[PDB]
Each structure stands twice: as C-alpha cells, then as structure tokens.
Amino acid sequence: GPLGSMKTILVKNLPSDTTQEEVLDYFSTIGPIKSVFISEKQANTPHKAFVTYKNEEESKKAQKCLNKTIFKNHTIWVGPGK
Ligand code: NA
C-alpha cells in the first residue's frame, strides 16, 4: 500500500485550502477510506488528492456519485487513480 490499483481514486480541482479531514469526511459517505494524500501545490491553484477506499467497489461508486459534484465551490473531477 497505501494505494490500490482499483481502490484509489484521483480527485482533481480541489480548492487549495482543502484539508485531509475535509476530503475524508466528504468521500467517506460512500464507504470507508484507508488513506488520503493531497498534492502539495501553491495556494489559490487547483489541488489534487489520492483517496484510497478499503473496498474496490466503493471506489467505483465514488467515481459515479461524486464526479462533477460541488465541493467548496469547485466542481470536482473524480476518476481512477490507477
Ligand atoms: Na505535488
């Protein structure tokens, strides 16, 4: 680990102030999450995160349910992280 080929999603277009806990809380509504890494980037530029679910099926559900939803004013893009 900590990532998994089908268990990890990549989330794009997060606001720069997003915290790991905020990501955890939002994404864990789909299923339990094992880890969250947020990419280190300049403030006021879009951020990315890798979110790894405990179960592959829940990763797929997050892609379906949470892609192009609004998170802190941003439309987030959710897909396989591979
Ligand atoms: Na980075």
Side-chain angles (χ1 to χ4, degrees), residues 37-51:
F37 305 83
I38 299 178
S39 200
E40 193 159 68
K41 296 190 175 300
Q42 185 64 9
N44 299 265
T45 72
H47 279 47
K48 298 174 182 175
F50 291 111
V51 177

Side-chain angles (χ1 to χ4, degrees), residues 49-79:
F50 291 111
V51 177
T52 300
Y53 282 88
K54 189 180 176 214
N55 299 296
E56 287 182 31
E57 275 171 283
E58 288 163 341
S59 172
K60 290 178 181 57
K61 187 171 177 182
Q63 294 175 48
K64 185 220 177 146
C65 298
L66 300 180
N67 185 47
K68 294 189 177 180
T69 61
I70 302 159
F71 178 86
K72 296 163 64 62
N73 299 101
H74 288 231
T75 308
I76 58 167
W77 301 322
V78 181

Side-chain angles (χ1 to χ4, degrees), residues 4-61:
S5 46
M6 296 311 278
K7 291 184 285 289
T8 300
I9 58 170
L10 175 59
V11 184
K12 304 178 187 180
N13 196 35
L14 294 165
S16 65
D17 61 291
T18 304
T19 66
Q20 295 157 24
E21 179 179 355
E22 283 175 319
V23 170
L24 174 63
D25 288 342
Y26 190 84
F27 284 85
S28 66
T29 61
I30 305 294
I33 288 168
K34 293 201 299 190
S35 62
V36 176
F37 305 83
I38 299 178
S39 200
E40 193 159 68
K41 296 190 175 300
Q42 185 64 9
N44 299 265
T45 72
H47 279 47
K48 298 174 182 175
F50 291 111
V51 177
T52 300
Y53 282 88
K54 189 180 176 214
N55 299 296
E56 287 182 31
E57 275 171 283
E58 288 163 341
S59 172
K60 290 178 181 57
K61 187 171 177 182

